[PDB]
Amino acid sequence: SGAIYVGNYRVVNRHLATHNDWANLVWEDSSRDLLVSSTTAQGCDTIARCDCQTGVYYCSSRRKHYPVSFSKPSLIFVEASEYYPARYQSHLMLAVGHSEPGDCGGILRCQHGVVGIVSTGGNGLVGFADVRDLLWLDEE
Numbered sequence: 173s174g175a176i177y178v179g180n181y182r183v184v185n186r187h188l189a190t191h192n193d194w195a196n197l198v199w200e201d202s203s204r205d206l207l208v209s210s211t212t213a214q215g216c217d218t219i220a221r222c223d224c225q226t227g228v229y230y231c232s233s234r235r236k237h238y239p240v241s242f243s244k245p246s247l248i249f250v251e252a253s254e255y256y257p258a259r260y261q262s263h264l265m266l267a268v269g270h271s272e273p274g275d276c277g278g279i280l281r282c283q284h285g286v287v288g289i290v291s292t293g294g295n296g297l298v299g300f301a302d303v304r305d306l307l308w309l310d311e312e
């Protein structure tokens with residue numbers, strides 16, 4: 173589990189969105205595994221605006237933050253899970269690292285701010301849904 177809290181937005185994995193998220197919906201995209209809902213309180217996270225390929229992510233199944241190198245956001249074929257059939261996921265970045273299904277929502281960050289959230293995993297790989305192209309998260 174986990175979310176990004178930027179301005180009056182909450183960014184979560186679409187497959188983990190709650191009824192309150194769907195009832196206060198701003199934007200959602202199943203191909204990216206992302207959903208954004210509106211919040212009453214202002215958040216403290218800042219979004220990175222960059223092309224970094226090194227950063228740190230939080231792994232809840234280890235209670236640890238790990239430094240990683242990750243690929244640029246791409247269209248990758250991801251195997252079936254309990255939330256999606258095997259399909260192409262867009263705007264996804266891969267790294268070598270531990271993950272498990274409940275690690276989704278952990279933040280990946282670089283020197284400039286939040287880069288994305290854990291979305292996919294298996295066999296010593298972790299995949300992150302990028303948010304750096306969502307420029308509108310920084311305003312209104």
Ligand SMILES: Cn1ncc(C(=O)NCCc2cocn2)n1
Pocket residue numbers: 187205250251252253254255256261271272273274275276290291292293294298299
């Ligand atoms: C870190 N991690 N390890 C496994 C999973 C997982 O099952 N993701 C669920 C969301 C998803 C994206 O594409 C297909 N399913 N996440």
Ligand SMILES: [Zn+2]
Pocket residue numbers: 220221222223224282283284285
């Ligand atoms: Zn960066």
